Design a protein around this ligand. Sequence first.
Ligand SMILES: Nc1ncnc2c1ncn2[C@@H]1O[C@H](COP(=O)(O)OP(=O)(O)NP(=O)(O)O)[C@@H](O)[C@H]1O
Ligand SMILES: Nc1ncnc2c1ncn2[C@@H]1O[C@H](COP(=O)(O)OP(=O)(O)NP(=O)(O)O)[C@@H](O)[C@H]1O
Ligand SMILES: [Mg+2]
Ligand SMILES: [Mg+2]
Lengths: 114, 228, 228, 114, 114, 114
Amino acid sequence: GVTLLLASQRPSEISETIFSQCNTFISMRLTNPDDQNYVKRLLPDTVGDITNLLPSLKEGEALIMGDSISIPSIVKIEKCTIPPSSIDIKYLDEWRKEWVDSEFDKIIEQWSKS
Amino acid sequence: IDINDRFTFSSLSLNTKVSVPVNGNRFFNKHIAIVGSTGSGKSHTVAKILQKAVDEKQEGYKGLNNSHIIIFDIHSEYENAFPNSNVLNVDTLTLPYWLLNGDELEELFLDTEANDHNQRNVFRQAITLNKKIHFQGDPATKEIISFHSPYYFDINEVINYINNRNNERKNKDNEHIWSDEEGNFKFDNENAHRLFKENVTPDGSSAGALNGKLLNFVDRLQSKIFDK
Amino acid sequence: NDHNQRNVFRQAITLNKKIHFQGDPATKEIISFHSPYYFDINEVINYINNRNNERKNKDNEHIWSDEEGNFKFDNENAHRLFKENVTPDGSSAGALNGKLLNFVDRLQSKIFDKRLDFILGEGSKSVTFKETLETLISYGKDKSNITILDVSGVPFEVLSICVSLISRLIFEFGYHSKKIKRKSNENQDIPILIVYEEAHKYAPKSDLSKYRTSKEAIERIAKEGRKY
Amino acid sequence: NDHNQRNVFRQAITLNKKIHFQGDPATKEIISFHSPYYFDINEVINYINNRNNERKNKDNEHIWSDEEGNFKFDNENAHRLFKENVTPDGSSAGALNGKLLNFVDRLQSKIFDK
Amino acid sequence: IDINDRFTFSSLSLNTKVSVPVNGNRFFNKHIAIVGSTGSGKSHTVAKILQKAVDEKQEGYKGLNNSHIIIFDIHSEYENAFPNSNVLNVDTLTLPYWLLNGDELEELFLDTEA
Amino acid sequence: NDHNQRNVFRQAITLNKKIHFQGDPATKEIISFHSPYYFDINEVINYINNRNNERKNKDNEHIWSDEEGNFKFDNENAHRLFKENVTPDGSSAGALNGKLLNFVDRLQSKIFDK
DNA sequence: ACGCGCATGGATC
DNA sequence: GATCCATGCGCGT
Ligand SMILES: Nc1ncnc2c1ncn2[C@@H]1O[C@H](COP(=O)(O)OP(=O)(O)NP(=O)(O)O)[C@@H](O)[C@H]1O
Ligand SMILES: Nc1ncnc2c1ncn2[C@@H]1O[C@H](COP(=O)(O)OP(=O)(O)NP(=O)(O)O)[C@@H](O)[C@H]1O
Ligand SMILES: [Mg+2]
Ligand SMILES: [Mg+2]
């Protein structure tokens, strides 16, 4: 009754002993060819042509395979109405404003706490 | 997939009107590995699957279902996705040191390797004895208490045990004699529980088996205890 | 088997960080080995050299004498080993007696290394945490959008630690800025771009030891850096 | 990859470059192991060969005796180990006693080669 | 495979009504390695092999045959697969310490060496 | 790869090469273990065999006896250790006592091998 | 004489 | 490098 959900940023950097036991596989955009070859060999040769769409995947588009799904298919995950607190930083929009005072006293006080 | 075992959290990319359900039992009993580049929606998808598991309730009630999910969240992001959840940090979570079995008691506390056989022995014998002393159940369970038993022991009196045995003094009969408020006694299995306190004064003629050979052991052990 | 030098290394640094702290002494207790607080590195040598000369008595406790007088080596008097003007009184060699001669001799070689003068020089005493961080991102008296790090004709040994420290210091500045803003429900307002020109030097494909400590400094920025 | 052999090599050559410098003291302090200054390799071997025979006393300090009298091995008197005519005087084995003999025999194997 | 050499426990995947017997003498004397991902069915396959080995009885007698199978059960599965079997947990199994052949007697009692 | 056999073999051989060397003294200090000049290997046997008879007195010195007189273990007096007719005088065992017998037996085996 | 204490040493991993 | 162990020498009854 104890299973795992492995969330990792590259398939070729986690140990195979944990990774091989994961029958259910969710694959998002993978620009590394070593990763796409790892997703290639997890598939049969008949459904081996869908992984060519891996580096072209948009945000929220995933490739799901395993005994849970009928066929390995590229799916669009439902948008999170209550999302995690991970918002991308608008670098151009932040840099366009003025120089900030940036409160150095509070940062290194909290840094020294940790 | 049958009607009851369907688990939907996504639709087909080419056809948004086509829903893609997976076998919810087979989705979770066999482990899930979700991978992708940075910004690909991996953390949002993990939260989305966890949310669909939480509201996966059979008809007949309103309260919480039987979902039990533990998140090792290293970016402080999943608190927002689950506002009705319990969030634990190191400053508040308490995982007791006496819940370790034999393997991680040596891994957390002992940094010596391959030449520490007397230091390993006084470590397990202090812990096993202290677990037996604080036990309050039936005596039949008391004697099966061993080194890996998840029972409470005081690591401060464990240090007191190795500190006392660091000053042990044997007599002419090669037996260790101690003195405390109760009186003189001999170090054996029925009296070694009196070494967990620091008001015990050794009495003897010659140095014991561990006299002076545990000073660096206590210093390394007290460093891990006092490490914040 | 380097666990007693490793123990006495952090014990010297953690203690010296507490004595050189002049503030709220509730914070003084949570100062530890990785805390970014000032400690005298020469006083650390004074601690380890004394610990090499230590001598325990019959009771297994190390005794010392300085200009003030005789005292016991415990947590409340370990700060008096930071000066050379101490004489050990005892009947037997202590726990670390004679075990730190090559440890000190190797460690002073790092301090008097002129390659490492920007880190272990006499100028590290005067600067504080705030001045170092404003220097890195040009937040001092003169302000700049671009900070250039002139490491043109510099050896790899001090190039690698320049890269690994500053990449970590900027990352943890970016990390700790986000947690400060998350208390006020705001986002990070200092986005920092670090330019690694001719990155073949410090982050190559090969897995050598001198290539190691600068690879995960850039890997951690590559992996989880854009959140902060 | 012996760090005790590495440390004794640098501390011999750095010290030997100091004693043969004839110049301004401020430049003398910045002399280190990589700095391009003259040192004599025969005295460097003698320093390492002597440090194969160190004998500490009960106060953990190495004591020797050249023709001018007994001395304690410290920063000021470490240049006296460059000469061969030093005899160790102590009770216990020194800090680098017996840890540098394979270092020395290979060191003079390359010097003596024509 | 000879008619007295046949030991069938499986049928072909492409065609159900054809059995795939193996050389039973060659199946068990030459060691068996069964591998597959988690939940593939290795335990059921192992249990089915040992079940067909138990009822592999030559004609002419009643009662259990000369099979001898020892299972190292670390997940407590084969008790229900073999109801008429002997189960030995640590609390009831007694292996004498004087049965050690010296080498294990050397390693059981001394955590030190050399 | 016994370390302590390696050293005594070179102090036997390098010293033996200095005794039999007939050239001018200036190249006697460049004499090493890898220098191609004559040394008598039977005297190398007699050195290592005698060093296995080392006797240490109260003041930590090795004292031998010879036809010419009695001498201590000094580098000048170590040259006369190459003869088999010496007898040790002392109180206790030496530094290399009892650990070079298998080294001598291997060396005698090679030389008396046809 | 023997006992205890301390120091040196080396055996390994 | 540290732990462990043994052998030895010196000072005490
Ligand atoms: N189903 C979706 N549809 C549309 N946009 C999405 C979807 N899921 C996620 N996103 C967007 O993708 C962004 C990146 O998602 P994120 O939660 O950072 O996953 P991530 O790839 O794991 N980030 P990281 O942990 O650094 O690798 C989010 O901020 C959303 O804006
Ligand atoms: N011949 C079979 N036909 C159909 N289902 C089978 C068969 N053999 C096993 N199973 C199924 O396999 C599952 C149990 O797998 P199991 O026999 O435990 O394999 P396993 O590899 O030993 N599991 P694990 O120990 O974690 O590796 C059940 O759902 C069974 O129904
Ligand atoms: Mg994420
Ligand atoms: Mg199984």
